[PDB]
């Protein structure tokens, strides 16, 4: 995949100490060559090309867990949240935080958006709820009037959400500590508190994303396997069952570690599946052409020198690339934003 290392940035230090590495970074996202990254008490906006950190926002004691961009009609707002259950929407270009939503009383695991009719924000927190917010249009004074559209109850802690590709505003998939489920997010139904519509059968699911319009890439921990299953065939096979085995398309061989919270991503335009491992490698799968199939390439942790010494051991949690797959970011538990071209 002709990938080369372009930057190794340490910009989320605690106490602004260059010696802070152990702090773990959790999520990153490209603005609709600009990437936002979060971890520790800071949210950073980084130019993958030049390596300059464009913006940094610090809130005391917070351990940010998710960031996501959204293009609003014309501000590309950045949403961040974390330990304190508060969703902070930052106008990065303008350089200040516009509003804060006190979404949950427990930690917010991760955030998501979709091409919903507008300004939707699913928030998945440890209180076992996924709340759908309509943050509304900002008034002349950069103020938001957030509304609650719907509350999803989960049998376990949700970890990652992926709106259904072919109906992103009708059904939602979410990875939870008890497995994966599908929730009906259609607005025309009147009921506001909805349980999981269908619980899927393949244990926690720490990685979940669509490879293309119909194929879902998912993974857990302690299985060394990444499952590919079709959304269309599963939904056709549902009927009225609340528990439904998925229609598996293929399995991909992955590291056998039992460690959790290793998330995956995709680059649909290139038919790629990305997932970091406990050795800091990036496992890449080109499933276009596609027994446990092998990874197409393993991008080993190049052991960059830190303080004059190599950082020999670490872990990569999140890997995200742009639609054209010109830049790939891998976040580590070592306060290093690994950037690859």
């Amino acid at each position: 995949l002709h990938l080369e290392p372009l930057h190794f940035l340490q910009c989320h230090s605690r106490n602004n100490s260059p010696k802070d590495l152990e702090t773990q970074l959790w999520a990153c996202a490209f603005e609709p060559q600009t990437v936002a990254t979060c971890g520790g008490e800071a949210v950073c906006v980084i130019d993958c090309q030049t390596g300059l950190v464009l913006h940094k926002y610090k809130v005391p004691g917070e351990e940010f867990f998710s960031v996501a961009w959204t293009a609003l009609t014309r501000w590309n707002m950045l949403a961040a949240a974390g330990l304190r259950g508060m969703v902070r929407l930052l106008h990065v270009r303008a350089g200040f935080c516009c509003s804060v939503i006190r979404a949950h009383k427990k930690a917010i695991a991760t955030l998501c958006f979709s091409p919903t009719h507008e300004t939707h924000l699913f928030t998945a927190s440890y209180d076992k709820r996924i709340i759908l917010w309509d943050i509304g249009v900002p008034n002349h004074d950069y103020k938001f009037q957030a509304s609650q559209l719907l509350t999803l109850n989960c049998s376990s802690v949700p970890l990652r959400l992926c709106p259904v590709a072919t109906c992103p505003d009708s059904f939602l998939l979410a990875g939870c500590e008890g497995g994966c489920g599908c929730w009906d997010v259609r607005l025309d139904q009147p009921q506001k508190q909805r349980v999981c519509e269908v619980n899927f059968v393949f244990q926690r699911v720490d990685g979940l994303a669509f490879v293309n319009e119909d194929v879902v890439a998912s993974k857990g921990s302690g299985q060394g396997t990444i499952y590919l299953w079709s959304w269309s065939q599963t939904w056709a096979s549902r009927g009225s069952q609340s528990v439904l085995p998925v229609v598996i398309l293929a399995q991909l061989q992955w590291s056998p570690t039992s460690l959790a919270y290793f998330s995956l991503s995709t680059c649909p335009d290139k038919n790629l599946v990305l997932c970091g491992d406990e050795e800091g490698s990036v496992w890449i799968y080109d499933v276009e052409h596609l027994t446990l199939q092998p990874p197409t390439q393993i991008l080993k942790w190049p052991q960059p020198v830190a303080l004059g010494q190599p950082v020999t051991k670490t872990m990569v949690n999140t890997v995200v690339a742009n639609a054209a797959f010109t830049y790939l970011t891998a976040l580590t538990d070592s306060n290093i934003v690994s950037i690859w071209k």
């Binding site: 290392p5 372009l6 930057h7 190794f8 940035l9 340490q10 910009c11 230090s13 602004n16 260059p18 949210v43 390596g51 300059l52 950190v53 464009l54 913006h55 940094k56 926002y57 930052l90 990065v92 350089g95 200040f96 935080c97 190049p302 052991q303 960059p304 020198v305 830190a306 303080l307 950082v311 290093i336």
Partner: peptide, 18 residues
Amino acid sequence: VPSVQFVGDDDVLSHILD
């Protein structure tokens, strides 16, 4: 292989404020 580049609070081009 590039080494790890430290970016302190004074290295940021801009700070986001409340």
